[PDB]
Design a protein around this nucleic acid. Structure first.
Ligand SMILES: [K+]
Ligand SMILES: [K+]
Ligand SMILES: [K+]
Ligand SMILES: [K+]
Ligand SMILES: [K+]
Ligand SMILES: [K+]
Ligand SMILES: [K+]
Ligand SMILES: [K+]
Ligand SMILES: [K+]
Ligand SMILES: [K+]
Ligand SMILES: [K+]
Ligand SMILES: [K+]
Ligand SMILES: [K+]
Ligand SMILES: [K+]
Ligand SMILES: [Mg+2]
Ligand SMILES: [Mg+2]
Ligand SMILES: [Mg+2]
Ligand SMILES: [Mg+2]
Ligand SMILES: [Mg+2]
Ligand SMILES: [Mg+2]
Ligand SMILES: [Mg+2]
Ligand SMILES: [Mg+2]
Ligand SMILES: [Mg+2]
Ligand SMILES: [Mg+2]
Lengths: 109, 51, 112, 139
RNA sequence: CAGCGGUGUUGUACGAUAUGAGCUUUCUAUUGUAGUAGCGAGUAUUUGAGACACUGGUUGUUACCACCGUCGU
RNA sequence: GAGCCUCUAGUGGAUGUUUUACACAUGUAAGGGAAUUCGGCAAAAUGGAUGCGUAACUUCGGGAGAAGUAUUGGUUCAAUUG
RNA sequence: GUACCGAGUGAUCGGUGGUGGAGGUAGAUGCAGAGCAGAUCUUGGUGGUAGUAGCGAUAAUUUGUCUUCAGCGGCAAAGACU
RNA sequence: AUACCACACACAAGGGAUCGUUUGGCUCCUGGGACGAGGAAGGGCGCAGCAGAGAGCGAUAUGUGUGGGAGCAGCAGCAAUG
């Protein structure tokens, strides 16, 4: 995975990355742009991104015309099974009470 | 529909038995020169006029 | 036996719509092997096919509003759209009155 | 009208049988070279030395509260000139001594400043310094 | 991405607590005493609060040093 | 058995890109208010219920919802259809 | 039938080398359904325009997982609509 | 004109002209000129070991008698007891 097989835990500013996107389709295009954010943060454009169903379900919670302001996610990096020339990044939802104090952390296991 | 006369039913029964390709053994026979049965029809492309 | 067909036959057996049938995920082989209504009856008995519950539509607000209107709330001049006669029919008021009065006179005469 | 209202309706006569270069057509607008003649220097100064007028006895730099919107704070020397100037913030410009002297009375007059505005350019700016904001609010 | 400073926009968060035009008289222990309440729009305090953005200021953490082609010496 | 919202039962694909100008369906506008145009064409304004108050003319039936004006939410009470 | 080369003012005629696989002329006379660039000619076959114009009125779609072997196909979980 | 457009030649595509062939047509001549209540002409439906169309035949849907005589076109079976 990452250095010392750690997972990286980060927060995604969904409010900012979607500023220009139309109200009618906000949640549909937000998914395309969450994946793009990840690939630039780890400098790996050609890689795959995989979204766990719990994270999908959190994002769609107020229907198509909305998206949450911030979301906290744990990321793992693995070789892509269907073509191991690529990597795949796997995203898991982390439930938080408040965002105050949460930076970017690397956690063992 | 579900209501039919006897005369209409026999027309449908006959029109249904005739609608078949050339059987696969005939093609092997020395004297036989047909390719495809030109009398085959589709319900999407023709009317029977049974009415 | 395609899985869409399993749902149709199950819907027939459990007397509900196809939108309420749940197929269990962990033995698709066991489902796909089914051939007949009696196979499906066994799968239903074993709990691999399940009828889901109905979606909720509560009467909380309807009851609350009804009690308030019984106390005489709402029902002011800015809440009504029909004519006085549509809301409280005039022929009905007459018919209620005169039957009471006639009944009163009948009893008084008959009792002397 | 059908087929659109935001156009020139007639783009020529029958003869000559070509479109003339004098008729208006759609195309590029903006991003052209332009020279503005005879602009006057009101003030010259430095981004980190405070200044005052004979009348405004506050001492402050040229920088408004929170800086200029996509630039921040001036640090080096600066010039101040009358009116507006070509291009957005951050573009390079060339300055030249005037080609010929002006006879107009509006150009050749003296300038005496009494106040310079230093309030915020984001939103309605209502204070001239952080001291005033700290005094208006509590603590 | 977060602190901590700075500059704005909106208008005073959730939850508690107190009051409120009026309407009402319930319970426990036990013979007679003591205990002893409900229902209610709104308003005030905590609270220029809470939310949201930008920072060419400053601290922490995390990521990034490749590769392929063309013309020349 | 209007429009708007839900229960039962049923439902959906020519891919990606924030995407100028000119369009086609729509919103909003300082001061002025038909100056526009063959022509107020298009749009705006009025709108339900309750009360007060209602002209010429008329075949005496009508005109007539004439016109013109006021009221309307939530809560807690009285009184019983006002 | 196809490339070359020669003869004739010309309509046309002759030879050589490949392809083809069973029929064909030179002279004198006889009989005609006897020579094409055109008729908005008749029938059949093919271009440029052009990888262009267009293919998207209506409720709306996302994620995982298996097949499919590469079907927004099927199944689970959400989001919508009549 | 490095790559576009045009023309010439060789090879590969695309189409079916030409030449060679014909159990068909047309014309003239000669014969014939034979249907039905004893159900005609014309229409429908059935019949094969595997059988759609067409040909042949009627629930006896390849039967009887006479004259001949070697195979039944594919696959499986039949045939001098035809
Ligand atoms: K019918
Ligand atoms: K049909
Ligand atoms: K009446
Ligand atoms: K509060
Ligand atoms: K406050
Ligand atoms: K109904
Ligand atoms: K209704
Ligand atoms: K006018
Ligand atoms: K006029
Ligand atoms: K008009
Ligand atoms: K009269
Ligand atoms: K009138
Ligand atoms: K021709
Ligand atoms: K000619
Ligand atoms: Mg028009
Ligand atoms: Mg500004
Ligand atoms: Mg205006
Ligand atoms: Mg105005
Ligand atoms: Mg005019
Ligand atoms: Mg109009
Ligand atoms: Mg030969
Ligand atoms: Mg001719
Ligand atoms: Mg186009
Ligand atoms: Mg709708």
């Amino acid at each position: 995975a990452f250095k010392d097989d750690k997972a990286i835990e980060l927060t995604i500013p969904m409010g900012k990355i979607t500023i220009d996107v139309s109200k009618r389709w906000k949640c549909r295009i937000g998914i395309r742009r969450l994946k793009k954010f990840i690939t630039k943060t780890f400098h790996d454009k050609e890689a795959e991104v995989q979204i766990s169903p719990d994270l999908n379900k959190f994002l769609w919670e107020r229907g198509m015309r909305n998206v949450p302001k911030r979301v906290r996610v744990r990321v793992n990096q693995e070789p892509y099974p269907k073509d191991p020339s690529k990597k795949v990044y796997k995203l898991s939802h982390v439930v938080v009470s408040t965002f105050k104090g949460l930076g970017t952390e690397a956690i063992a296991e | 529909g579900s209501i039919k006369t006897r005369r209409i039913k026999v027309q449908l029964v006959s029109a249904l038995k005739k609608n078949r390709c050339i059987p696969q053994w005939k093609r092997a026979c020395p004297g036989f020169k047909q390719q495809y049965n030109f009398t085959k029809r589709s319900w999407k492309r023709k009317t029977l006029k049974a009415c | 036996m395609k899985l869409p067909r399993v749902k149709e036959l199950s819907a027939d057996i459990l007397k509900c719509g196809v939108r309420r049938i749940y197929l269990d995920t962990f033995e698709p082989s066991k489902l796909s092997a089914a051939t007949s209504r009696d196979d499906i009856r066994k799968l239903i008995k074993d709990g691999l096919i399940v009828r889901k519950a109905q979606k909720i539509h509560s009467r909380y607000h309807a009851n609350k509003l009804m009690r308030e209107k019984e106390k005489g709330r709402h029902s002011g001049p800015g809440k009504v759209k029909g004519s006085k006669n549509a809301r409280m029919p005039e022929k009905d008021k007459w018919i209620k009155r005169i039957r009471d009065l006639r009944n009163t006179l009948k009893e008084l005469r008959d009792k002397g | 009208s059908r087929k659109g209202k935001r156009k020139v309706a007639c783009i020529g006569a029958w003869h000559p049988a070509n479109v003339r270069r004098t008729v208006a057509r759609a195309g590029q607008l903006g991003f052209h070279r332009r020279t503005a003649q005879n602009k006057k220097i009101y003030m010259m100064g430095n981004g980190k030395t405070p200044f005052s007028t004979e009348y405004d006895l506050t001492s402050k730099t040229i920088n408004p509260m929170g800086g200029f919107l996509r630039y921040g704070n001036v640090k080096s020397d600066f010039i101040m000139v009358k009116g507006g100037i070509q291009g957005p913030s951050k573009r390079v410009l060339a300055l030249r001594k005037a080609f010929a002297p002006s006879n107009l009375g509006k150009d050749n007059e003296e300038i005496v400043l009494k106040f310079v505005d230093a309030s915020s350019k984001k939103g309605y700016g209502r204070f001239q310094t952080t001291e005033e904001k700290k005094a208006y609010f509590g603590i």
